[PDB]
Ligand binder design. Structure first.
Ligand SMILES: O=C(O)c1csc(-c2cccs2)n1
Ligand SMILES: O=C(O)c1csc(-c2cccs2)n1
Length: 281
């Protein structure tokens, strides 16, 4: 059982050591499309690239590239698109991907500004009456409603395909209280947030995959998917205690590099799953 494994790594302070074994064991696949010169300004970080085998392709004939990966968790029947915080030049691409993949929900785990730097473009409207048009991708985006709470904000946006006049409801779930440094002290507000995303239907197989991002789409984004998948596997399996976080993380790392950036994020992931299991058991 992971609870016992937690006290062991904690009492022994072996987190950096566990983390390094995961680093060592992690898959490595070509990312040739990311590294093409024409795609240099579509990447926020030069060392964070989608693998070619799992990358999302835009349906635009010119350049099909976006820094986004499909994570398919076969046993849990869960898919996620992990992407970087959009750049000023990729906000159009980001909404094209949401449209093309039939995503219901966008999960945002960062603030637009952290540590006095811009971590993300402002890719959604701030007021009902001031909609955004993405001329490059022929999409219009309108803020319908905004529900601001202590730890997160839920926004009801509407996506309109200007080419076809189809419109769709998109839910934007914005976790606003992740600290600039380290991880939250308690996973309570993060779990509440995750249950709120689940309750919306945004993670359900009726819909395209949820889009999850932070700045790079590997650290906080990783913790989100890892906690969701692990909790679902504990509901699905005959023996809940057969669920090994480390194995789940390594399976997710076949789809996108670097998921969980620090030994602190790994410890927090354990804590979130252990705590979440009490509500589930
Ligand atoms: O920083 C930017 O360039 C930016 C953020 S949102 C946005 C646009 C929405 C619609 C057309 S451009 N641009
Ligand atoms: O009554 C509502 O809640 C309402 C009025 S317009 C609207 C939406 C449009 C597009 C997505 S949600 N909802």
């Amino acid at each position: 059982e992971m609870e016992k494994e937690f006290e062991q790594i904690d009492k022994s302070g072996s987190w950096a050591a566990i983390y390094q074994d995961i680093r060592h064991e992690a898959s490595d696949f070509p990312s040739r499309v990311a590294k093409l010169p024409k795609n240099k300004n579509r990447n926020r970080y030069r060392d964070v690239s989608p693998f070619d085998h799992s990358r999302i392709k835009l349906h635009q004939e010119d350049n099909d590239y976006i820094n986004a990966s499909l994570i398919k968790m076969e046993e849990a029947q869960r898919s996620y698109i992990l992407t970087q915080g959009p750049l000023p030049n990729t906000v159009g691409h980001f909404w094209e991907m949401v449209w093309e993949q039939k995503s219901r929900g966008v999960v945002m785990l960062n603030r637009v500004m952290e540590k006095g730097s811009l971590k993300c473009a402002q890719y959604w409207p701030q007021k009902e009456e001031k909609e955004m048009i993405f001329e490059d991708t022929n999409l219009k985006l309108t803020l319908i409603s905004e529900d601001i709470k202590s730890y997160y904000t839920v926004r009801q946006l509407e996506l309109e395909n200007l080419t076809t006049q189809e419109t769709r409801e998109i839910l934007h779930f914005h976790y606003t209280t992740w600290p600039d440094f380290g991880v939250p002290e308690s996973p309570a507000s993060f779990l509440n947030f995750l249950f709120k995303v689940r309750e919306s239907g945004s993670l359900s197989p009726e819909h395209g995959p949820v889009v999850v991002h932070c700045s790079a789409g590997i650290g906080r984004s990783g913790t989100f998917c890892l906690a969701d998948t692990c909790l679902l596997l504990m509901d699905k399996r005959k023996d809940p205690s057969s669920v090994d976080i480390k194995k789940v993380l390594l399976e997710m790392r076949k789809f996108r590099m670097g998921l969980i950036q620090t030994a602190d994020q790994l410890r927090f992931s354990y804590l979130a799953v252990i705590e979440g299991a009490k509500f589930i058991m």
